[PDB]
Amino acid sequence: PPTPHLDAIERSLRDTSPGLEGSVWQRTDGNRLDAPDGDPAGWLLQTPGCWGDAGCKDRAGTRRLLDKMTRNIADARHTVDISSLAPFPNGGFEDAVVDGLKASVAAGHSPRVRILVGAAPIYHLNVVPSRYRDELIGKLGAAAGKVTLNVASMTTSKTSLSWNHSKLLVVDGKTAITGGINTNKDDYLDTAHPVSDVDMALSGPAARSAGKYLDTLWDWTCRNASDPAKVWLATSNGASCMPSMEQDEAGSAPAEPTGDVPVIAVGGLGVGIKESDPSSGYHPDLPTAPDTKCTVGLHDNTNADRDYDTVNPEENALRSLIASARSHVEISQQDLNATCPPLPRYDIRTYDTLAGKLAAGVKVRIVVSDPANRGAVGSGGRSQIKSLDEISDTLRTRLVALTGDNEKASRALCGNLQLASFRSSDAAKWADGKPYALHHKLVSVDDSAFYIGSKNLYPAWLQDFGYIVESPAAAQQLKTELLDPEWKYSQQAAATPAGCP
């Protein structure tokens, strides 16, 4: 079956980062979206799972996520690979890891386990890698002797604010769960106002691609344990750091197909791991029109750095996914814009891509977390805008720079843009007064191809990872289970841009 959206994205990735193919990005065939029996859309792991249920008393999506995480780890024969934003997995996320590992050992296995978290320079890690390792060993009991642990917290650039933000669980290089969900009990479990988020589960060659991505992070992490300012590392049982655990498990044989789904795995190396993909001939004419509402203090990696693109192919993967839309594109995000300064306020090429779609008659929907969400920098579901106008006004600006006059800009903007704050029920706020917070990193185009992962569309220079799937059947499930319900409730919080009926 034809894959016109993946083909376009693949061309962009091979132009941007040819040397990173097979490590930081990879297209594979023959994957399976990992759904349980009798629940065909069950590969889509939404949390809390309460569409149209303002009370959200039964948080069935959260339970299904933790169950699936546990089962995947319980099935581990050789390797368990976990990455997240700090802190190390706690609460029910930790129970899933402990329970799964105990089951793997009870089945006769001696699994190797890597657990990697990224830490902002300002973030104080309460439970450091040595203490987290020790806590796990205690909870593992007698099984701890059979489990090889590598536990590490990392920061790759202090000045350029770069650390691991990818959210991955990869087992045996064969199954993978990824998305926006941090293993942080205070955002999803121990809370009266849970964040809305989505992960996906697959099996097949693209799970190995995720493993190769984590091998790239652990190669750097193991080497830079020589600098405790950057890396804190703890291992169990006297074990060495395992930079290439996924390659060792993969061996020489190619990954075995498990279904028929084509997937592009794509991530980025942030800042401070690798300065450029230096086999790349990528030579963009980077955007000339700068956001006159803000100026970045730091060097602008998002909008003004060729080298950064070459080691962060996920940036161009998302731009080319959006650019591939022939009929309609749905964007569901925490934010489209970043707090500026210190980061650039928006990705210029992304907004220019969206403006081009609006002017060409392509339907564009943007749903973001409500601006009433104000949290600390790094909180899930926070918003970085005061009003949805900051999105529509910027689109209007880029439209004028493209069409030439404001009246054409208005016809494109008013006729083809849907813009709203996220809602999951008829209720505007939670019972405890707090508003709904959205943490998706999702893009879907033409009900044919979609991204689910950890990479936000707003500017950020972190290590991130995600999958782009092209499958009309899977995108129909996504539409039915997530996108249509999202708009059913979010349209009650829609914006009418300035200058529109």
* Span from 38-46, 70-78, 289-297, 454-462 in contact with ligand VHY (CB under 6 A): 454-462
Quick one: tokens of 403?
A: 């069409």
Q: Contact between 380 and ligand VHY (CB under 6 A)?
A: yes
Distance of CA 305 to the CA centre of its chain: 22
Report the relative pairing of strands 231-235 and 261-269 from DSSP bridges.
unpaired
List the one residue from 378, 404, 415, 472 that touches ligand VHY (CB under 6 A).
378
In the complex, least distance from residue 268 CB atom to ligand VHY, rounded to whole angstroms: 13
Options 5, 109, 165, 193, the catalytic residue: 165
Contact letters for ligand VHY, residues 344-373 (x by CB under 6 A): ------------------------------
SS3 category, 16:
helix
Q: Contact between 120 and ligand VHY (CB under 6 A)?
A: yes
Options 81, 99, 277, 464, the catalytic residue: 464
In the complex, least distance from residue 259 CB atom to ligand VHY, rounded to whole angstroms: 29
Q: Is 197 one of the annotated active-site residues of the chain?
A: yes
In the complex, least distance from residue 377 CB atom to ligand VHY, rounded to whole angstroms: 6
Cβ neighbours, 10 Å, residue 61:
23
Q: Which is nearer to ligand VHY, 188 or 282 (CB)?
A: 188
Please report, as a single letter, which amino acid is at residue 177.
Answer: I
Q: Contact between 415 and ligand VHY (CB under 6 A)?
A: no
Q: Which is nearer to ligand VHY, 183 or 403 (CB)?
A: 183
Q: Cα–Cα distances in Å, from 468 out to 34, 157, 178? A: 15, 27, 11
Long-range contacts of 66-69 (CB under 8 A, 24+ apart): 66/92, 66/93, 66/95, 66/96, 68/177, 68/201, 69/93, 69/96, 69/97, 69/100, 69/169, 69/177
Q: Is 335 one of the annotated active-site residues of the chain?
A: no
List the one residue from 28, 175, 337, 456 that touches ligand VHY (CB under 6 A).
456
Biggest CA-to-CA distance, the chain: 72
Q: Is 439 one of the annotated active-site residues of the chain?
A: yes
Please state at what angle helix 60-74 crosses helix 91-106, rounded to 10 degrees.
30
| CA separation for the pair 492, 486 (Å, rounded) | 10
Q: Which is nearer to ligand VHY, 359 or 388 (CB)?
A: 388
Q: Is 464 one of the annotated active-site residues of the chain?
A: yes
In the complex, least distance from residue 383 CB atom to ligand VHY, rounded to whole angstroms: 10
In the complex, least distance from residue 456 CB atom to ligand VHY, rounded to whole angstroms: 5
In the complex, least distance from residue 165 CB atom to ligand VHY, rounded to whole angstroms: 5
Q: Contact between 47 and ligand VHY (CB under 6 A)?
A: no
Total binding residues toward ligand VHY, as defined by CB under 6 A = 14
Q: Which is nearer to ligand VHY, 57 or 124 (CB)?
A: 124
Instruction: Using the structure block, give the residue that is written with the tokens 């991530």.
Output: 267
In the complex, least distance from residue 369 CB atom to ligand VHY, rounded to whole angstroms: 9
Q: Contact between 268 and ligand VHY (CB under 6 A)?
A: no
**Could you say which residues in the range 132-191 bind ligand VHY, by CB under 6 A?**
161, 165
Q: Cα–Cα distances in Å, from 251 out to 53, 73, 111, 246, 412? A: 48, 21, 16, 9, 52
CB 368 within 8 A of CB 383: yes
Q: Contact between 343 and ligand VHY (CB under 6 A)?
A: yes
Beta bridge mates, 466: 266, 453
Q: Which is nearer to ligand VHY, 140 or 271 (CB)?
A: 271
List the one residue from 50, 85, 170, 468 that touches ligand VHY (CB under 6 A).
85
The full length of the chain comes to: 501
Options 172, 197, 215, 291, the catalytic residue: 197
| CA separation for the pair 313, 400 (Å, rounded) | 29
* Nearest in space to 199 (alpha carbons), one of 167, 233, 152: 167
* Span from 241-249, 254-262, 272-280, 374-382 in contact with ligand VHY (CB under 6 A): 374-382
SS3 category, 34:
coil
In the complex, least distance from residue 292 CB atom to ligand VHY, rounded to whole angstroms: 22
Quick one: tokens of 9?
A: 């994205």
**Could you say which residues in the range 276-335 bind ligand VHY, by CB under 6 A?**
334
Beta bridge mates, 28: 263
Give me the helices (H) in 189-347, please. Answer: 205-224, 245-250, 306-311, 313-323
Q: Which is nearer to ligand VHY, 120 or 273 (CB)?
A: 120
* Nearest in space to 500 (alpha carbons), one of 415, 422, 395, 388: 415
Query: Catalytic residue numbers?
Result: 165, 197, 439, 464
Please report, as ranges, the residues that interact with ligand VHY according to CB under 6 A. 85, 120, 123, 161, 165, 334, 343, 377-378, 380, 439, 456, 460, 462
